[PDB]
Amino acid sequence: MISLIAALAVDRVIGMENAMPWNLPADLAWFKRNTLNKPVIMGRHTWESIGRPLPGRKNIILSSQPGTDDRVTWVKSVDEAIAACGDVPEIMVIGGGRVYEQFLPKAQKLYLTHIDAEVEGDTHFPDYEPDDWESVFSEFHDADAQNSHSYCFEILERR
Ligand SMILES: NC(=O)c1ccc[n+]([C@@H]2O[C@H](COP(=O)([O-])OP(=O)(O)OC[C@H]3O[C@@H](n4cnc5c(N)ncnc54)[C@H](OP(=O)(O)O)[C@@H]3O)[C@@H](O)[C@H]2O)c1
Ligand SMILES: Nc1nc(=O)c2nc(CNc3ccc(C(=O)N[C@@H](CCC(=O)O)C(=O)O)cc3)cnc2[nH]1
Numbered sequence: 001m002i003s004l005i006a007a008l009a010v011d012r013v014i015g016m017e018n019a020m021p022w023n024l025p026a027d028l029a030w031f032k033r034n035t036l037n038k039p040v041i042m043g044r045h046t047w048e049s050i051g052r053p054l055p056g057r058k059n060i061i062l063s064s065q066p067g068t069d070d071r072v073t074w075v076k077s078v079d080e081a082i083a084a085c086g087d088v089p090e091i092m093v094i095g096g097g098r099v100y101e102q103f104l105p106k107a108q109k110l111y112l113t114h115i116d117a118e119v120e121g122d123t124h125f126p127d128y129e130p131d132d133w134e135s136v137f138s139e140f141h142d143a144d145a146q147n148s149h150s151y152c153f154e155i156l157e158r159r
């Protein structure tokens with residue numbers, strides 16, 4: 001099974017200048033709890049943004065050119081990225097915008113955090129069709145001393 005996981009601010013904005021301009025450790029914790037001990041597939045810009053391998057995960061990086069770090073696995077196509085995950089129950093796709101667009105039609109489940117934050121951005125999650133998905137989990141949280149915006153964790157499954 002292929003799943004996407006992403007955090008979306010207003011108007012589906014997911015990044016600006018190769019960074020994520022919010023700070024929500026509650027959402028980083030959700031990300032870790034949902035990805036740990038799974039393979040993660042990401043694009044080269046997201047790799048550069050994160051800046052280091054994500055421990056306890058098989059990191060798979062898409063790039064059309066040769067890899068530059070043997071702490072991670074580098075592949076050159078969507079089909080090769082999937083294959084390098086081996087026979088696992090769940091493959092997590094962790095972005096960015098260009099990678100999410102390609103994996104969207106292949107995926108069975110979306111783990112989306114909806115952040116109540118107004119962000120000028122230059123990267124957007126794909127414009128996904130409502131009718132194709134069913135929401136199986138949602139959980140709203142107000143802002144607090146650690147998390148400066150409200151946020152909702154949703155899980156959707158493909159109908
Ligand atoms: N809010 C969130 O959850 C979230 C999650 C992830 C990322 N982000 C953000 O998203 C932004 C990055 O997104 P992005 O769209 O610019 O970049 P990206 O999708 O992360 O990376 C794009 C790059 O991946 C490689 N790639 C993609 N598809 C490929 C394919 N089919 N075959 C070979 N290589 C392929 C290419 O690398 P080469 O140019 O080397 O060929 C390409 O330029 C950043 O702002 C980041 O902070 C936000
Ligand atoms: N829900 C969600 N939130 C995100 O922030 C997010 N970010 C990306 C890509 N960027 C990032 C940036 C940092 C880390 C990171 O350092 N995570 C650590 C620590 C989590 C924590 O603070 O507890 C990890 O081990 O997962 C992961 C992905 C992809 N999907 C996401 N999905």
Ligand SMILES: [Ca+2]
């Ligand atoms: Ca296009």
Ligand SMILES: [Ca+2]
Binds near residue numbers: 009011013117120121
């Ligand atoms: Ca915004």
